[PDB]
């Protein structure tokens, strides 16, 4: 994708009625992170799912480690959560030459405030000002009132932990229902006039 969503407003593409081989991503090896849960990454192109959800967003390098089942942290709890029984793959790569700008690429936002934690795969993109204190905000930013999101300082001089990374998470939904997303199971040449 030309552009990825902010982690607070991560995109979700529902994938159905199609075919692809997961090992392609593996083999290209453009990633710094490539970890699967539930399903092995080792060419598991023989599995079919009802749906596949490809979630995507941009975060800092030091945040990549939070995108996983069993994790806690500012993203894992308030921007993007994965379930304990998640089946899926987390792929991430350094996007410093795409998502960084001179002066800082502040087009990417993350949530700092919420009154509760997110559910697995919950997306909440509300811009209503958060009340941290006891008095009402009445739409005004101030001490004890925070517009819930903040931008990332994605500067050209950032060290690796502060460089932007593109994260794509593939959730594999297996239901007692007809499957629609499978891999391109390998075929061979037709051979005629011989025992086959």
């Amino acid at each position, epitope marked *: 994708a030309t552009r990825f969503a902010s982690v607070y407003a991560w995109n979700r593409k529902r994938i159905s009625n199609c075919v692809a081989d997961y090992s392609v991503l593996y083999n290209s090896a453009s990633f710094s992170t490539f970890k699967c849960y539930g399903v092995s990454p080792t060419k598991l192109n023989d599995l079919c799912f009802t749906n596949v959800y490809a979630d995507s967003f941009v975060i800092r390098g*030091d945040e990549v480690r939070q995108i996983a089942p069993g994790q*806690t*942290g*500012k993203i894992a709890d*308030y921007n993007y959560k994965l379930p304990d029984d998640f089946t899926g793959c987390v792929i991430a790569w350094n996007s410093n030459n795409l998502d960084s700008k001179v002066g800082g690429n502040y087009n990417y936002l993350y949530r*700092l*405030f919420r009154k509760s934690n997110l559910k697995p795969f919950e997306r909440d993109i509300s811009t209503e000002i958060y009340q*941290a*204190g006891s008095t009402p905000c009445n739409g005004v*930013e*101030g*001490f*004890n*009132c*925070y517009f819930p999101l*903040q931008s990332y300082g994605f500067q050209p001089t950032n*060290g690796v*932990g*502060y460089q932007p990374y593109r994260v794509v998470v593939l959730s594999f939904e297996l239901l007692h229902a007809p499957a629609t997303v499978c891999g391109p199971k390998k075929s061979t040449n037709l051979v005629k006039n011989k025992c086959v």
Partner: antibody
């Protein structure tokens, strides 16, 4: 490189005043809140006051409310604490520190502080 | 007016040993709590901000995590330069309060 430098401490008589000043460099003040933090010898840290540099809005700890006023100047890239009617209870090392936005953020840079004492 | 309780007042762990200090907010502090390191005669240095963000210039040995209102301050392995009094600050709301300070010693 970001630096914060305190001045304006020293000995005052009770009921008198001292004006702390924090020079700053390496960043602007706008978009940040400037804060003063107090620490009595042998004690932990206490927030005293804060100002949002781009708004002029302030917040104060109850413990110094009324007696202290906080201000900042974005053209000068400096900030001040005006401490009036100083009490024996206000003897402490004062530090300037900064955090991003009005609040909700920790303090990245700290100066080394100055000692403020009150004694008859 | 969210108060912070820090425990223990002192902790011992020898060089190479792991340190965990717990900071408890009396109310939700969101993810606006910061961890500072103080040496005698010096201003507190920021180690970790907004609960889990390691501050640039701070050794990778420093880390931390959250459960509810409990903020765990962790040093994966102590070196002689890490024996300091550690403090938590709650920037979520005003006034800003701090914990009491935990002194780390060497298990002599």
């Amino acid at each position: 490189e970001v630096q914060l430098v305190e001045s304006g401490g020293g000995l005052v008589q009770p009921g008198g005043s001292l004006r702390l000043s924090c020079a700053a460099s390496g960043f602007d003040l706008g978009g940040y809140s400037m804060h003063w933090v107090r620490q009595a010898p042998g004690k932990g840290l206490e927030w005293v006051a804060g100002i949002y540099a781009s708004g002029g809005a302030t917040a104060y700890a109850d413990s110094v409310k009324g007696r202290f006023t906080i201000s900042a100047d974005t053209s000068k890239n400096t900030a001040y604490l005006q401490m009036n009617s100083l009490r024996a209870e206000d003897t402490a090392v004062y530090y300037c520190a900064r955090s991003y936005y009005y609040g909700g953020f920790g303090m990245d840079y700290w100066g080394q502080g100055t000692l403020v004492t009150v004694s008859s | 007016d969210i108060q912070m309780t820090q425990s223990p007042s002192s902790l011992s762990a020898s060089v190479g040993d792991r340190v965990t200090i717990t900071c408890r907010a009396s109310q939700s502090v969101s993810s606006a709590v910061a961890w500072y390191q103080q040496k005698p005669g010096k201003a507190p240095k920021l180690l970790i901000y907004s609960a889990s963000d390691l501050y640039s210039g701070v050794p990778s040995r420093f880390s931390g995590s959250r459960s509810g209102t409990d903020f765990t301050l962790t040093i994966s392995s102590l070196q002689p330069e890490d024996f300091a009094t550690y403090y938590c600050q709650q920037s979520h709301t005003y006034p800003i309060t701090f914990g009491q300070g935990t002194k780390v010693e060497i298990k002599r």
